[PDB]
Amino acid sequence: TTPRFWSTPLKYCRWAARERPALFFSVVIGALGPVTLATVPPLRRLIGDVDAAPIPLTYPIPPGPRKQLKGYDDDTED
Amino acid sequence: ATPAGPPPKNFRLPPPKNWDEESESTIDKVGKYFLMTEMLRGMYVLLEQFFRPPYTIYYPFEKGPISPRFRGEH
Numbered sequence A: 001t002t003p004r005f006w007s008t009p010l011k012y013c014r015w016a017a018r019e020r021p022a023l024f025f026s027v028v029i030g031a032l033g034p035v036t037l038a039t040v041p042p043l044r045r046l047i048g049d050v051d052a053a054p055i056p057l058t059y060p061i062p063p064g065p066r067k068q069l070k071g072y073d074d075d076t077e078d
Numbered sequence B: 001a002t003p004a005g006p007p008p009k010n011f012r013l014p015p016p017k018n019w020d021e022e023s024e025s026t027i028d029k030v031g032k033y034f035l036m037t038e039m040l041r042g043m044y045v046l047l048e049q050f051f052r053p054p055y056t057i058y059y060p061f062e063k064g065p066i067s068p069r070f071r072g073e074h
Helices: A009-019 A021-047 B026-035 B037-050
Strands: none
Touching: A009 A021, A009 B026, A021 B026, B026 B037
């Protein structure tokens, strides 16, 4: 009486929603993970929702040679 | 089991209905299951009783009713 998935895929899906709701919708929620991983970030780019840059978690050492500053030397003390 | 004579009209039940033939929508079926609608309704009944007057009397300062026919100590 229970439908078979590989012969009639859609009929099985309706039965599982109605007769095994906890198992069926776990698979549906579990599959929404990958679905939003494919839809939203492309969607967000189009609307202009840009990703924030990472915050610094270490001292941000400036790239390049040292600037050769002249100021606040020892003669400036006192 | 049945009385003698012809079977009572419509005594035989109709055949069982398959899942496919149930006259109730999936959204309602899924909603009641996950939301526990009939359990919520039963809880709501208790709140209605929570605000109704209690039946308790404060014995021995108050007494329950007895009749002139009441049979106690001889």
